[PDB]
Structure 1
Amino acid sequence: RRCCLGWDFSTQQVKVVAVDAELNVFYEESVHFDRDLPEFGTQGGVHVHKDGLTVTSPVLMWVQALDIILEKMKASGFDFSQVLALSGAGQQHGSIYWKAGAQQALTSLSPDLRLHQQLQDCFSISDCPVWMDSSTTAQCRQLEAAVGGAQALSCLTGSRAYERFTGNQIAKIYQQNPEAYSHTERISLVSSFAASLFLGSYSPIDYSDGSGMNLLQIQDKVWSQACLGACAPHLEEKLSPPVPSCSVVGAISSYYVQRYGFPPGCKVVAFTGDNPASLAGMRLEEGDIAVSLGTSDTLFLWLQEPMPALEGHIFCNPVDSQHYMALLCFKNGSLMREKIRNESVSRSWSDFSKALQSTEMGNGGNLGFYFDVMEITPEIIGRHRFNTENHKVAAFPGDVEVRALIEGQFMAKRIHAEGLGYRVMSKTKILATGGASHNREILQVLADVFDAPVYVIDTANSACVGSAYRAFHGLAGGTDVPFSEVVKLAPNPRLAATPSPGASQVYEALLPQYAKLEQRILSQT
């Protein structure tokens, strides 16, 4: 059974899957940080500092989690001689600061010792900033001022300045800890840090995860000298040139061959961010979108011609380096759906579904926005309801409320997607995942709004699986063959809904009206 490994260096755990050549996930293992490395004192895999804004993880905890999981794999009888290649994902934005001399330690790893034991003194920063950090507002404003504004920075890098984005974190470390910065020979993302551990030498940063830093020029795929200089000095030398995501970055270190029995020819395919890896795992193509429904809703888009904005994040595409992808994040997700259920349909998902079945597409022209917490896409708060004459109203009947919520949430996803350059195409498939993807009536609204078929997919391990698929791509020809052709053989996700007759006519007229009301609410703020 020949296989590839797909890794995920996530916030709360390190996870791995082994996928055979039939693209069967036949093995999965994980190390949970709070539970299995409780000595670091993390909660949810991180440390929220006294200020309530700084959020970090110890780099040596991630190294040790790799040692533990390889030993857990070996203890279970995993046959490492069967591994042809591996790739992985890292929680985006988080950064690792390697101390001067660390590459000599990586290239001289002894198979008689664990990684953590040998890399103990290799980090100039022990507490790494992660994606949950919101402590760099001053640096964000400085970077936007240095490059001509928020929109200029988005045009250049796919995003305006966000506190968690790596360049702003690097700037804070340079300003507050210049000694540690002066002792840093290399800076990695979590993804490229993990790839470096497998190579036994520094891995380059890939174009896709490299797009989550406010540093890479996404169009020309070179570092922006203006962004680099506005963040910290000598920064280019520390990052090294970025590479296409579908690059073989080297063979696995002899460390792993000797300690665990990996074959010497095992290839390391460049690692990427967890959201880019999930896009690969979900097998999105040109014209596709994925809706991940949860506490936060996340929209994944394929983009040929992106239009960066003051919202959303455009990244270089991990499975087609000449094109792009985007993420749009919505704070009012599953808690907002549960609240309307509890308020209007007796705390019952069945009655929620019956409300959707008993109301027509377009909801008689009744439209609603439901933001009990400040929304990020767009920046609005409150509940706002409008009747068919576009007059504000205080409330709706119960069933009308349920449809206004669901239809409005999906119309917002289509409008904001199209603002970034997305367009529905004849080939378009919509992939739905998360709790609400288990409701047929919710997915019917989604199919109706986009006028395209909706498929349900399980994504508990999408970043791991996507990483294993990318590794197989690397083996099946790399850039000589399309990613989509390599993983076509994986069973197709199940069709949940197709647009009802007349859906096109209803939402062609209602979508611009909903967009107009959104701008009306934004103008009143």
Structure 2
Amino acid sequence: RRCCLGWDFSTQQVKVVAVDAELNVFYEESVHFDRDLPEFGTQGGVHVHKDGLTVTSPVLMWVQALDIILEKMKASGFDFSQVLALSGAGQQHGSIYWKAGAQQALTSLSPDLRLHQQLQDCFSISDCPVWMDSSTTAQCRQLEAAVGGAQALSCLTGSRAYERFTGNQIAKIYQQNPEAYSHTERISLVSSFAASLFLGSYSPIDYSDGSGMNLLQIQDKVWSQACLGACAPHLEEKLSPPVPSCSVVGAISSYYVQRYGFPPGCKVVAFTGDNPASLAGMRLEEGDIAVSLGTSDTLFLWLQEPMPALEGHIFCNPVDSQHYMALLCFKNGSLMREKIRNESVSRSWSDFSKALQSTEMGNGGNLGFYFDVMEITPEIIGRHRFNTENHKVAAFPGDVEVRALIEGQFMAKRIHAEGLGYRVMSKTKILATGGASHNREILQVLADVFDAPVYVIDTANSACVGSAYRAFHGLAGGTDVPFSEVVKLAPNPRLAATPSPGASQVYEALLPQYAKLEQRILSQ
């Protein structure tokens, strides 16, 4: 049983899966930060600072967690001699600042000691900013002004300036702690930091996670000189050139060979971000989209031809370096669905389903926008309801309300995805995951709106699994072969719904009416 390992250096834990060559997951293990390393005093794996905006994690907690998990695997009897290759994912945006002289410690690791003990003094910043940090608003505004505005930055990097994006965090560290910045020889993302631990030398950053920094020119796949210069000095030499995601960055360090019994030929495939790795785990191809339903709803799009905007995030594609992917986040998700269920259908998901069954596609032309909290895609708040003559109304009947919510939420996902360059194709598959993916009637509206089949998939280990798939892709030929042909044998998702007859005719007319009403609300 030969295998690849798929790692996930996440906010709350370090996780690993072992996938065999038939692409079956046969082993999983994890180390949970608060529970297993309580000495760091984290909550949710992070430290929220007094200001309520600065959010960090101690770098050495992530190092120590890797030591614990490898020893936990050993103690369970995991056969490391069977590992042909490995890759992994990192929580996006988060950064590691390596102190001058740290690569000498990485390259001289002794198998008799743990990583934590040997890399103890290798970091110029002990508390790493993570994806939850929102303390860099001034750096965001300065970065945008320096390059010609929010739209100019997005065209260049796939996103306007976001507080959590790495370049804004590097700028804040350079401004507030210039001494630590001057003593930093290398800056890694969580993904490339974790790859560096397995190599025993610095890994480059990949194109895909490299796209979550407001630094990489996504088109030319080179660092933007204007973005680098607007954040901190000598930054390019600290980052090193970025590489295609399907790159063998080196063999595993002899440290792991001697300490754990990994074979010396075990290959380390470039790590990537957790969202890009989940896209690989979900096996999205051209024309596909995944809908992650939850407290926030997240759209994962494949993009051949990107159109960066003031909303969403375009990244270089992890499984096809010539194309792209995008994330679109919706703040009004499951709480909004639960509130409408409670108000209109007697707190019953069954009556919620029956309201969708008992109403026609297009809802008689009744359209609704439901934003009890300020929405981000787009920036609107309030509930806004319109009847078949496009007149604003105060309320709908209960059943109409349920369909207006579900049908509007899915039409918005389609409209905002097309704003970034996405187009439904004859090959299109829609993948759905999360709480609301357990409701057939909700998934039917989704199938009708996009005029494409919907499949349900469990994604709890999507980043791990996607990483093991990418490791297998590197062994099966890398850039010489399509990722999709390597993973064709992986488990297929179950088909949940297919568009009803006439759905295309209904939504071809209704989608432009919904988009016009959205623009009407934004302007007024």
> What is the TM-score when the length of structure 1 is the normalising length?
1.00
Whole-Å separation in 1 of the counterparts to 2:469 and 2:16: 13
Percent of matched pairs sharing the same residue? 100
Q: Tell me by how many angstroms 1:224 deviates.
A: 0.1
Whole-Å separation in 2 of the counterparts to 1:371 and 1:46: 29
Whole-Å separation in 1 of the counterparts to 2:380 and 2:486: 42
Whole-Å separation in 1 of the counterparts to 2:35 and 2:343: 37
CA RMSD, Structure 1 to Structure 2 (Å): 0.4
Deviations 1:124-168 (A, max 9, x none): 000000000000000000000000000000000000000000000
Q: Tell me by how many angstroms 1:290 deviates.
A: 0.3
1:315-330 superposed matches below 5 A:
315-330=315-330
Q: Tell me by how many angstroms 1:230 deviates.
A: 0.1
Deviations 1:428-458 (A, max 9, x none): 0000000100100000000000000000000
Whole-Å separation in 1 of the counterparts to 2:34 and 2:385: 43
The residue aligned with 1:225 is: 225
Q: Tell me by how many angstroms 1:492 deviates.
A: 1.4
Q: Tell me by how many angstroms 1:78 deviates.
A: 0.3
Q: Tell me by how many angstroms 1:419 deviates.
A: 0.3
Q: Helix, strand or coil for the counterpart of 2:474?
A: helix
Whole-Å separation in 2 of the counterparts to 1:404 and 1:43: 38
Q: Tell me by how many angstroms 1:240 deviates.
A: 0.2
Whole-Å separation in 2 of the counterparts to 1:384 and 1:12: 38
Q: Tell me by how many angstroms 1:330 deviates.
A: 0.5
Whole-Å separation in 1 of the counterparts to 2:246 and 2:505: 41
Q: Helix, strand or coil for the counterpart of 2:207?
A: coil
Deviations 1:439-494 (A, max 9, x none): 00000000000000000000000000000000000000001100000000012110
Deviations 1:60-85 (A, max 9, x none): 00001100000010010000000000
Deviations 1:181-208 (A, max 9, x none): 0000000000000000000000000000
Whole-Å separation in 1 of the counterparts to 2:17 and 2:9: 12
Q: Helix, strand or coil for the counterpart of 2:518?
A: helix
Q: Tell me by how many angstroms 1:345 deviates.
A: 0.8
Q: Tell me by how many angstroms 1:89 deviates.
A: 0.2
The residue aligned with 1:245 is: 245
Please identify, of 342-351 and 221-230, the stretch whose mean Cα deviation from structure 2 is larger. Answer: 342-351
Deviations 1:362-410 (A, max 9, x none): 0010111111111110001111111111111111111111101100000
Whole-Å separation in 2 of the counterparts to 1:239 and 1:447: 43
Deviations 1:32-91 (A, max 9, x none): 111111111111111111111000000000001100000010010000000000000000
Deviations 1:214-261 (A, max 9, x none): 000000000000000000000000000000000000000000000000
Q: Helix, strand or coil for the counterpart of 1:208?
A: helix
Q: Helix, strand or coil for the counterpart of 1:413?
A: helix
Whole-Å separation in 2 of the counterparts to 1:178 and 1:311: 32
User: What are structure 1's unaligned runs of at least 5 residues?
Assistant: none
Q: Tell me by how many angstroms 1:20 deviates.
A: 0.3
Whole-Å separation in 2 of the counterparts to 1:372 and 1:58: 36
Whole-Å separation in 1 of the counterparts to 2:288 and 2:106: 40
Whole-Å separation in 1 of the counterparts to 2:338 and 2:70: 40
The residue aligned with 1:439 is: 439
Q: Tell me by how many angstroms 1:506 deviates.
A: 0.3
Deviations 1:489-513 (A, max 9, x none): 0121100000000000000000000
Please identify, of 242-251 and 386-395, the stretch whose mean Cα deviation from structure 2 is larger. Answer: 386-395
Whole-Å separation in 1 of the counterparts to 2:20 and 2:172: 44
Q: Helix, strand or coil for the counterpart of 1:202?
A: coil
Q: Tell me by how many angstroms 1:114 deviates.
A: 0.4
Q: Helix, strand or coil for the counterpart of 1:385?
A: strand
Whole-Å separation in 1 of the counterparts to 2:477 and 2:286: 20
The residue aligned with 1:160 is: 160
The residue aligned with 1:380 is: 380
Deviations 1:84-131 (A, max 9, x none): 000000000000000000000000000000000000000000000000
Whole-Å separation in 2 of the counterparts to 1:280 and 1:428: 16
Q: Helix, strand or coil for the counterpart of 1:87?
A: strand
Deviations 1:317-339 (A, max 9, x none): 00000000000000111111111
Please identify, of 339-348 and 14-23, the stretch whose mean Cα deviation from structure 2 is larger. Answer: 339-348
Whole-Å separation in 2 of the counterparts to 1:393 and 1:126: 55
Please identify, of 496-505 and 383-392, the stretch whose mean Cα deviation from structure 2 is larger. Answer: 383-392
The residue aligned with 2:451 is: 451
Whole-Å separation in 2 of the counterparts to 1:120 and 1:379: 44
Whole-Å separation in 1 of the counterparts to 2:416 and 2:79: 47
Whole-Å separation in 1 of the counterparts to 2:281 and 2:146: 37
Question: Which aligned runs of 4 or more in structure 1 are off by greater than 2 angstroms?
Answer: none
Q: Helix, strand or coil for the counterpart of 1:194?
A: helix
**Residue 305 (str. 1) matches residue 305 (str. 2):** yes
Whole-Å separation in 2 of the counterparts to 1:126 and 1:382: 42
1:274-293 superposed matches below 5 A:
274-293=274-293
The residue aligned with 2:150 is: 150
